Design a protein around this motif. Structure first.
Motif, short mmCIF file in Angstrom:
data_model
loop_
_atom_site.label_atom_id
_atom_site.label_comp_id
_atom_site.label_asym_id
_atom_site.label_seq_id
_atom_site.Cartn_x
_atom_site.Cartn_y
_atom_site.Cartn_z
N UNK A 110 5.31 14.50 -3.44
CA UNK A 110 5.94 14.42 -2.12
C UNK A 110 5.30 13.26 -1.38
N UNK A 111 5.99 12.79 -0.35
CA UNK A 111 5.46 11.76 0.55
C UNK A 111 5.34 12.36 1.94
N UNK A 112 4.49 11.76 2.77
CA UNK A 112 4.31 12.14 4.17
C UNK A 112 3.89 10.88 4.88
N UNK A 134 9.13 4.39 -7.03
CA UNK A 134 7.69 4.45 -6.79
C UNK A 134 7.43 5.37 -5.60
N UNK A 135 6.21 5.89 -5.50
CA UNK A 135 5.83 6.78 -4.40
C UNK A 135 6.02 6.05 -3.07
N UNK A 136 5.58 4.76 -2.99
CA UNK A 136 5.73 3.98 -1.75
C UNK A 136 7.19 3.79 -1.37
N UNK A 137 8.06 3.49 -2.36
CA UNK A 137 9.48 3.31 -2.04
C UNK A 137 10.06 4.64 -1.58
N UNK A 138 9.60 5.74 -2.18
CA UNK A 138 10.03 7.08 -1.79
C UNK A 138 9.65 7.38 -0.34
N UNK A 151 7.97 -1.70 7.66
CA UNK A 151 7.63 -2.95 7.02
C UNK A 151 6.39 -2.66 6.17
N UNK A 152 5.20 -2.63 6.79
CA UNK A 152 3.97 -2.39 6.04
C UNK A 152 3.61 -0.90 6.04
N UNK A 153 3.36 -0.31 4.84
CA UNK A 153 2.90 1.09 4.66
C UNK A 153 1.49 1.07 4.07
N UNK A 154 0.59 1.89 4.59
CA UNK A 154 -0.76 1.97 4.07
C UNK A 154 -1.03 3.38 3.54
N UNK A 155 -1.56 3.47 2.31
CA UNK A 155 -1.95 4.77 1.74
C UNK A 155 -3.18 5.26 2.52
N UNK A 156 -3.14 6.49 3.01
CA UNK A 156 -4.27 7.06 3.75
C UNK A 156 -4.81 8.35 3.15
N UNK A 161 0.92 15.71 -2.31
CA UNK A 161 1.43 14.93 -1.18
C UNK A 161 0.68 13.66 -0.97
N UNK A 162 1.40 12.56 -1.04
CA UNK A 162 0.82 11.23 -0.83
C UNK A 162 1.09 10.84 0.61
N UNK A 163 0.02 10.71 1.40
CA UNK A 163 0.08 10.46 2.84
C UNK A 163 -0.05 8.98 3.09
N UNK A 164 0.83 8.47 3.96
CA UNK A 164 0.85 7.06 4.34
C UNK A 164 0.89 6.90 5.83
#
Ligand code: S76
Length: 154
Positions: A5-7, A42-46, A60-65, A81-84
């Protein structure tokens, strides 16, 4: 046995954007924007796709946190869950039948009306820290146990 999942948290210097989910999993709680990751995506595109679908914003810019694994006792699938985080967005948040977005001042984050784990990791997110976490829930309101540590690399 984990599902991606993404958040996404749109976090600006004095405020954060949260959305009130109208139905489904987590309805009735303020939350970041996200959902499942597609096959071949990809997780980032998701994360970028879900932010637009749920909030109407273009990032525009996403950072993995962070990375947080959730376990619900009795449910086989773990949520990975991948948090950005982003401070750079385009557009205005869109209210839809599924989601009601609202900006919150940092000292006014509605922790009582958010997933209980947020009281644990939001303080780290606010101080620009990265983290790995695991929360075991019993139902949707009780945290049985958890682990949470700061990391240099998500
Ligand atoms: C299960 N906990 C969480 C689920 C979710 O969608 N967002 C949270 O902040 N926490």
């Amino acid at each position: 046995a984990s599902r991606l999942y993404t958040l996404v948290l749109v976090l600006q210097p004095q405020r954060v954007l949260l959305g009130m989910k109208k139905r489904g999993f987590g309805a009735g709680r303020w939350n970041g924007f996200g959902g499942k990751v597609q096959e071949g995506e990809t997780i980032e595109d998701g994360a970028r796709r879900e932010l637009q679908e749920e909030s109407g914003l273009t990032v525009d810019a996403l950072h993995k946190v962070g990375q947080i694994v959730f376990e619900f006792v009795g449910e086989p699938e773990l949520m990975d869950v991948h948090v950005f985080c982003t401070d750079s967005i385009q557009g205005t948040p869109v209210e839809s039948d599924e989601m009601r977005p609202c900006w919150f001042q940092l000292d006014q984050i509605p922790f009582k009306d958010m997933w209980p784990d947020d009281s644990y990791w939001f303080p780290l997110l606010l101080q620009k820290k990265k983290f790995h976490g695991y929360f075991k829930f019993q139902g949707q309101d009780t945290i049985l146990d958890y682990t949470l540590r700061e990391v240099d690399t998500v």
